[PDB]
Every structure is written in structure tokens, then in C-alpha cells.
């Protein structure tokens, strides 16, 4: 006629950790991490990211010809570039304030490409057709970025150059140009005729003068010269001017745009889907009311705090046998 005492041994197998014993199996626990994700890259709240496959942001924005087809949009949630996207500055050189630009462009609401200095109209006294390199081949022939023009002496004279644009668009206008530093004085002279050549660029938000550096850098894509790439945001009301006695690689296409509070740039070989989520990761997305995750240091939108720990498992209840 007994009465005894005992406890629960659960069907549930998840193990947690203690001081004196690590491996230990329990009946109940909670996990504060999230290992799991949909293994996809989604539209973040109904907006699709932008995906540049073989191009990185520079070649894309510069209009590298390998980026010719790619995609477009007025809008994107974030930006994704692959591990394999190598199409950058095909003429060797430094992109300036690159990181900052990358951040401005992570999220965009309206993005409008317009040709800020028409190739036909804008440069009557300089030569707009010579501007190609083998450094930038397209279709088996010498080529250049689509969004810039490499301007060159017409003549045997390279006159002084000033063109101005007022921003009549409704938004910020991203404008990009570059500076050509040729390899030798002879090189300098062929292109711009003028050894004394300088370049100046200005606005309400921006003022800089440029002197090119003639020198022989190591051959890259066969170039011993260099090209620095610069940019700025011209305010809606604002005006921007350009002066050069040489060495200036002029804007052709610019972009009217309005930002969004930055998302990131995700670098992943993960594929996009028509799916959607709140929280995007390089590896995938996550639906969690969960506090953390070990998944990736890089998260987008509203996301669980990243953590480098393997497993966080508490205990709701006792051991089992």
C-alpha cells in the first residue's frame, strides 16, 4: 500500500550546460541564439535589394562595360555583391571616399540616372571620342566606363575647360568624375597638350583643386598611369562647376536620388528570392522574436544582436533518466 515520489523524464532531448557538468541533457531548456535562417536573401519588407553579379559597386556606378546589362531600379532595400564580383575600376586607380559612397547607396527610394553633360552637346572644343583603353575592353575592343568621358586635346590645342550644372532636379544629385595621372611627360602632352594642366571642381558642399602626378607606376591591366575617382552630392538648389587644362575625366551620366536610412552592403553568394523578411543576413534571413544569433556579424533592418558564442541554453526544468 505504497506512496512514492519521483519526477519527469521528457521526450525532449536538448542539452544545456552547467558549472560542474557541461554535456548534461535536460528535460527543458531555452535557446537565446538563433542558428537557423531561411538560407535566402529576400525582399526586405517588400522591397528587393540590388544585386550586381560580376560587378562590385565601383564598376557598377562608374558604368564599367562588364556591368552593361546587369539590372536597374528606382529603388532597392539593400545592396548585395558576390564574392565573385570583380568588375571594378578597369583603369587602375583609387576610388576616393569609396566606403562613404557605398554607405550612401545601401538604401535608395528614388534613383534616377540622367546624362548631366550630353556627350553631343557639351564639349565642343575638346575631343570626346578618343577616350578608350584596352584596360577596359568590351566586345573585344578598347573601351571605357559608360558614365564618364575621357577628354583629350582636339587640336594639338587643349583649351581651358569650364562647364557648369545647376541641380534642377528635385533631389540630391550624385556626380562622379576622375583625374588622370599619366605615366610620362610625353603621355601627359599627347592627351592634354598642356604640361601645366590642372583641374578644379566646386560647389556649396565642395571645393578641391587637382594636380596630376606624372610618374611610372607598375603595369596594371597594362596601365602605368593612374586614375583617381572622386564624387559628391550636389544639393537640390546647388550649382557645380568644372575647370581643367587637362587630365580631367568628365561626367556624362549622373544620378538624381533620395536616400533611406542606411541598410548595409551584404557580400554573399546567396541567391535572391521573391520572399520577404524583416531581418536579412549574409547567410540568409531570420524570423525570430529571438534576442540574438551566432549567424552573422552583419545584419540588416530590425535584427537580433550578433554574438560569437556557440550555444546559449538555459534551463526551464530538471534533468532526466
Amino acid at each position: 500500500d505504497t506512496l512514492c515520489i519521483g519526477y519527469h523524464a521528457n521526450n525532449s532531448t536538448d542539452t544545456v550546460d552547467t558549472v560542474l557538468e557541461k554535456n548534461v541533457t535536460v528535460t527543458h531548456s531555452v535557446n537565446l541564439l538563433e542558428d537557423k535562417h531561411n538560407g535566402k536573401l529576400c525582399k526586405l519588407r517588400g522591397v528587393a535589394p540590388l544585386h550586381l553579379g560580376k560587378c562590385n559597386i565601383a564598376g557598377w556606378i562608374l558604368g564599367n562595360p562588364e556591368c552593361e546589362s546587369l539590372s536597374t531600379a528606382s529603388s532597392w532595400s539593400y545592396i548585395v555583391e558576390t564574392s565573385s564580383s570583380d568588375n571594378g575600376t578597369c583603369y587602375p586607380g583609387d576610388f576616393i571616399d569609396y566606403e562613404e559612397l557605398r554607405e550612401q547607396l545601401s538604401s535608395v527610394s528614388s534613383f534616377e540616372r540622367f546624362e548631366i553633360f550630353p556627350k553631343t552637346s557639351s564639349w565642343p572644343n575638346h575631343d570626346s571620342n578618343k577616350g578608350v583603353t584596352a584596360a577596359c575592353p568590351h566586345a573585344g575592343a578598347k573601351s571605357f566606363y559608360k558614365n564618364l568621358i575621357w577628354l583629350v586635346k582636339k587640336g594639338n590645342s587643349y583649351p581651358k575647360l569650364s562647364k557648369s550644372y545647376i541641380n534642377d532636379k528635385g533631389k540630391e544629385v550624385l556626380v562622379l568624375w576622375g583625374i588622370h595621372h599619366p605615366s610620362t611627360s610625353a603621355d601627359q602632352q599627347s592627351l592634354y597638350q598642356n604640361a601645366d594642366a590642372y583641374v578644379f571642381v566646386g560647389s556649396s558642399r565642395y571645393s578641391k583643386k587637382f594636380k596630376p602626378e606624372i610618374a611610372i607606376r607598375p603595369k596594371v591591366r597594362d596601365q602605368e598611369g593612374r586614375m583617381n575617382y572622386y564624387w559628391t552630392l550636389v544639393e537640390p538648389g546647388d550649382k557645380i562647376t568644372f575647370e581643367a587644362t587637362g587630365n580631367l575625366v568628365v561626367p556624362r551620366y549622373a544620378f538624381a536620388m533620395e536616400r533611406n536610412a542606411g541598410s548595409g552592403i551584404i557580400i554573399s553568394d546567396t541567391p535572391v528570392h521573391d520572399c520577404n523578411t524583416t531581418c536579412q543576413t549574409p547567410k540568409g534571413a531570420i524570423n525570430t522574436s529571438l534576442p540574438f544569433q551566432n549567424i552573422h556579424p552583419i545584419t540588416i533592418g530590425k535584427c537580433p544582436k550578433y554574438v560569437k558564442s556557440t550555444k546559449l541554453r538555459l534551463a526551464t526544468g530538471l534533468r532526466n533518466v
Partner: protein, 148 residues
């Protein structure tokens, strides 16, 4: 006690009794109640406490320690738990063991073998915290002494 119960149902812990009536399982209420009332309470206060400063190495040095600081918070409240319930099992056992005393044999293993005849409302009586040692005293002493 040397094992758990696959057959337990309503809760974490309780008793299993075979009387002249029948057998089977059951568990307690308040003991399981105020258990989680205290547990989920603790589960909160830990994680809640972590946060950050404003008490009035980029993140690379901070993070690694934040974790190391956090990881242990679990290795504690975890440890402080498997001991917590264990304590509540003991407490369950002893609250009966003092109640019954001479009346039942402690064979251990959470198990008691009643010297007298216990059937329901005596059982639940024990459970209610109200059990009569006098009621069953002789019914016990007789049966117990035949043994010795």
C-alpha cells in the same frame, strides 16, 4: 531517488501510489506553480540585467568579454536550477516523511510503504498537509511490530 518517471504527466514532480484501490501517477500544484513563478522570473532578471552601461578593442575587445560575461550568467542560473528543483524534491519527500514518521517504511527512492491502510482523502489528506498520525497510529504499530 535513483530515477525519474516516464509516466509523469501533469507536471514536473509529484507522487505515484498503489493502494488497495489502484495505482498510477499524479503531481502537485503549488509546488509546480510557484516553481515557474520563481523560475521564469529568474530567467528574465538575468538577461534583463545584462544590457550595457550608462551607470552614472573596437567592439572586438568589448564583445568577446560581453559574451564571456553573458555565457557564465547561464552557467549559473542553469546550475542554480538543477539544484533548485532537486531541493524541491527533497522538500517534497521530507514533508511527507515527517508527517508519516513511524507510520510508513522509508525504503528510500522517494518510496514509502504504508504500515496501515491508506486510501483517498487520507492520501489527499497527506497532500493537503493534513494527515493524522493518531488516526493511523495503532493500525501502524501493530503491523510494524509483527515485522520485528
Amino acid at each position: 531517488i535513483e530515477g525519474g518517471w516516464t509516466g509523469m504527466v501533469d507536471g514536473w514532480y509529484g507522487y505515484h501510489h498503489q493502494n488497495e484501490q489502484g495505482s498510477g501517477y499524479a503531481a502537485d500544484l503549488k509546488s509546480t506553480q510557484n516553481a515557474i513563478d520563481e523560475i521564469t522570473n529568474k530567467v528574465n532578471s538575468v538577461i534583463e540585467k545584462m544590457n550595457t552601461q550608462f551607470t552614472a578593442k573596437v567592439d572586438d575587445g568589448f564583445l568577446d568579454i560581453w559574451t564571456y560575461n553573458a555565457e557564465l550568467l547561464v552557467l549559473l542560473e542553469n546550475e542554480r536550477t538543477l539544484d533548485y528543483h532537486d531541493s524541491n524534491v527533497k522538500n517534497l519527500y521530507e514533508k511527507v516523511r515527517s508527517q508519516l514518521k513511524n507510520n510508513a517504511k522509508e525504503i528510500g527512492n522517494g518510496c514509502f510503504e504504508f504500515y496501515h491502510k491508506c486510501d483517498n482523502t487520507c492520501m489527499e489528506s497527506v497532500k493537503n498537509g493534513t494527515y493524522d498520525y493518531p488516526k493511523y497510529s495503532e493500525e501502524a504499530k501493530l503491523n510494524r511490530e509483527e515485522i520485528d
